[model samples]
Structures are given as C-alpha cells and as structure tokens.
Target: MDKNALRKQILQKRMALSTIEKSHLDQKINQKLVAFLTPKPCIKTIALYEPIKNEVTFVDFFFEFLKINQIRAVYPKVISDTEIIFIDQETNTFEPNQIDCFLIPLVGFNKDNYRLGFGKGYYDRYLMQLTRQQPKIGIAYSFQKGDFLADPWDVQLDLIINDE
Candidate 1:
C-alpha cells in the first residue's frame, strides 16, 4: 500500500481497537521500551509525545518509569511546520540540542525504519537542525508497519517498536 493509504488504514484500525486492547498493548510496548533503554546510560533526556486520540499512551506507563530511573521526559511543542521544541512536564522548554533521544509517534512506518508522520515534516526538519545526532525511535501499534518508499527528506528512525 502507498504511504497515504496505509496511514489512513492503520490509523482507523488503531482507533477501532477496544479501550482494553489499547491499554494492554500500550503497557506491553512501554515495558519493552523501558527494558530496551534502561541500560543505555547516555540517554538521560528523552522526548516523548503527548498522546492524542487513539495514539499509544506512553505517558500513562512510561512517565513513571522515567521518574524512577532519574530520566527526564520532554514533550514536543510544535513551533511551526518545520520546528518543534522540547518541554518538560513542568513546561520548561529546552534547547534543540538537549534531547538525548526521541520516542516518535507515527501513523505508519516501513521495514526500512522510515516514519510516516502527519505530513508537516516537523520531525524531519527539527532533526536536521540538531548538531549532535540523537536516537529516534518510532512507537506505534504493530499493524502500522508495511512497505513504503521514503522521500529524500524523510528522517529514518534508528528503530521502531510496536506491540509485537
């Protein structure tokens, strides 16, 4: 399927999941994320999204883990079509370079790890402005994965994790 078509399909499917099903899958995914990042001592400040609609609820599970582990969680605030600034739970904004890693929300992604965002290219543009390379991980329901060719400007993720 094409990116736009697949995005619509997967997003609808995600919304179709029962509340219980969504909760279970999100918890499992969060566990996997915590386990995967726990030993990566260099990643202190992590950027995560404020979940909207049927998007996976990372904050419900992941935020507590971050606090326990002394990791700082930052949320992205959209500054423009090509810019996003990271803010803490307290809403203090940081320099673009402060993010150690990003937990990206996606509508769909390919096996090659390119993310399909909401079409504003905010992530792609923001990532390009960073002087230091940071890890970008795409988080979504497992069903969102499929084949799609990346545009030249797409910022490929370092990894993608779904409920699977």
Candidate 2:
C-alpha cells in the first residue's frame, strides 16, 4: 500500500483506541523506554514530543522520572513546513547533536523501521542531518506495523517502542 493509505489506515486504528486502553499501553511503553534508556546513563538530554490523537505519550509517564534523574526533556518546536528545533521549558534552543535521543510519533512503521509520519517530511529531514550515534525512537501501537516502501530520503529509526 501507498504511504498515504497505510498512514490513514493505521491512524484510524490508533485514533480508535479507548482512553483506558491507550493509557495502559502508554504505561507499558514507558516501562520499555525507561529500561532502554536508563541502562545508559549517558542518555540525559531527551527530545520528547507532545501527544496528539490517541498516540502513545512519553511526556506524562517519563516527565517526572527524567526530571528526578536530571534528564532534560526538550520539545520539538515546529517552525515551518519542513523544520523543527528542540527547545526546553524556557524555550532555549538546543542543537540537534546535543540531544541524547529523539522520541517521535509514528503514523505507522514498516518492518525496517522506516516510519510514515504526518507526511510533511519534517522528521525525515531533521533526522537526516543527525549523526547515527543519537538514537531515534518511534512510538506507536504494535498494530501500526505494516509493509510499506521507503523512499531514498526516508530515514530509518534506530528503535521503535510499541504497545504490544
């Protein structure tokens, strides 16, 4: 299926998730994320995203934990059609290389971890400029997994956390 069709189908499934179900799933995802990141104390600067629709949320679950652990949670501030910059609570700008990990929302992800986002190519463009040392994690439900073709410019994620 095409990216648009697959994105639509997967988003519909994600949007239909019950409030209770999504919350529980978000908790599970947080557990996995904490396990994956905390193992390496070097992961202190994190780029956490704001939630939309019924998508899995890292902010609610990890906000306090990271704060207590002295991890900075910066947000992606969208400035244009194909651009985003990370900013902290004080809105101070952060260089892409400064962040330890980027947690991005996924409309869907293929077997190879190439994500289908809102299709604005924002994540793809931003991720392409970053070094392979920083991990890019896609957050979504396991059902969002599908087979889709990746364009040459599409960047693949290093890891994906899904509510399995």
Candidate 3:
C-alpha cells in the first residue's frame, strides 16, 4: 500500500486497541527499552516525543528512571514545518548531535526500518542537522509493521521495538 493509505489504516487500528491492551503492550515495550538502554552508558542524553493519539508512551518512565540514573531526557518541539529541536524540562536547547538516542514515534514502519510519521518530515529534517549519527529507535505496536518504500528524504531507523 501507499504511505498515506497505510498510515491512515495503521493509525486507526492502533487507536482501536483497548486501553487495557495498550497498557499491557506498554509494559512490555517499556521492559524491552529498559533492557536495551540500561547497559548502554554512552546513551546519556535521550530525546522523546509527547504521545499523541494512541502512540506509545515512554516519557513518564524515562523521566524518573533517567533522572535517578543521571541521564538527560528531552522532548521535541516543532520549530517549523521542516525543523524540530529537542528541549529539556527547563527548555534548554540541544542539538541532535548531543542526543545519544532518539525514541521516535511512527504511524507505520517497514522491514527496511523507515518510519512513516504524521507526514510532516520533522524528524527527517531534524536528523539531517546532526553532524554525528546516533541510534534512532522506532517505537510502535507490532501491528503497525508493514512493507513500503521510503522516499529519498526518509531516514531508516537503527532499531525498532514493539509488542509483537
């Protein structure tokens, strides 16, 4: 299917998941994330997005856990249609180069690991600004996985985790 149609279909299916199901899947996803990140000391500064619609939620867990572990956590702020910047709780700015890991939201993703976001290309544009490459993990439900071609502007993820 095309990107737009696939995005709409997956989003609707994700939204259809009951709160209980989402909660269950969230716990599993959280466990996988903690396991993946806990041993990686280089991943000090993490960037995350505020959950919109039925997207996976990781902020609350990471905020408290990362703080106790002295790892910095930041959220993305849409600077423009083609720009996104990461900001801390104090609203201090950070470049993508400063982020060790980025947990990105996805409407749909394929085996090639390219993400389909809300069609804004915010993360794609933001990633282009980085001089240093870091790990980018696509966070979504297993059901959102599908086959699709990525546009030239699309950036493939380094990793992807979900409740499969």
Candidate 4:
C-alpha cells in the first residue's frame, strides 16, 4: 500500500485498540525506549512532534521525563512546503531559532531505516542538514512496521521505539 493508505490504516487500527491495551502498549513501548536509551543521559533538549489522532500519546510521560531531568523539550513546526524548523518547545507560540534537538519521529516503515512519514517530508529534510552524531528516533506502535523503499532522500533514525 502507499504511504497515505498505510498511515490511515494504521491510525484506524490504533483507534480500535482498547484503553487497557493502549496503556499496556505504552508501558511496553516505554520499556523498549529505555532499553534503546541505555543509561539515560542528561538530555538537555528534545524535539518531538505534536500528537495527532490516537498516536502514541507522548505528552504526559514525555514532559514528566524532561521535568525530572530538568531537560529542555522542543517540537517541530512546518516552516514551508518541504521544511520543518525545530523550535524551543511545545508552547503557545513558536518562532524560528536554533537548539540541540533529539527528534521523536512518526511512522517508520522499515527496520533497514526507511521512515514513511505523513508525506510532509519535513523531518527527513531537516535531518539531512545535520552532520554525524545526531539523536533521531521514530516512535510508533509495533504494528505500524512495514517495508518501504528507502529513498536517497530518506534518512534513518538512530533507533525506533515500539512495543514488541
């Protein structure tokens, strides 16, 4: 299936999950994330996307984690047709600026590192500008996995978090 079709299917599936099931999946996902983030360091800044539909729901725990570490959180804002600039955080207003950011990615299609996003191509293009040694990870449900062509323009994440 195409990216949009697959995305919609996944979103529908996500909504069908029961509240307890979703919570269980969240716990498992958090555990998986902690494993990937071994020895959780002092992450000063993090860039995460705004939750849409019944997505992974990163709000509560995400902010709590940051508050515990006194870490600065950040979010992405679509700047243009093919670009998304990283802002300081998820606040009432966001303006263009620079900061250390570890992106929380959305739909990831292949474990080989191809991420089939919402078709906006914002995060992929943004990461292309950065040099080596950057923190980027896609967060999603395990069922969202699929095979997709890794475009030369497509950048892989350092890791991905989903319940097993």
Tens-digit lDDT string for candidate 2 (7-42): 888877887888888788888888888878777788
How displaced is residue 89 in candidate 2, in Å?
Answer: 0.3
Query: What TM-score do all the candidates reach, one by one?
Result: 0.92, 0.95, 0.95, 0.80
Error of 3 at 151 (Å): 0.9
Model 4 TM-score is 0.80
Ranking by lDDT: 3, 2, 1, 4
lDDT of 3 by residue, 29-116 (tens): 9888888888898888998888889899884675677888888989988767778789999999987788888899989899889989
Per-model root-mean-square deviation over C-alphas: 1.5, 1.2, 1.3, 3.1
Writing each residue's lDDT as its tens digit, candidate 4 over 1-164 gives 56777777776777798988887887777666545444557445556667776667664664666677676667777758987766564453332233444546566567675677778787777787765355667787888787656777777877667786
* Candidate 1 C-alpha error for residue 42, in Å: 1.8
Highest lDDT: which candidate? 3
lDDT of each prediction vs. the true structure? 0.84, 0.85, 0.86, 0.67
Ten residues in sequence with the least summed lDDT for candidate 2 = 53-62
Total backbone clashes of model 2? 0
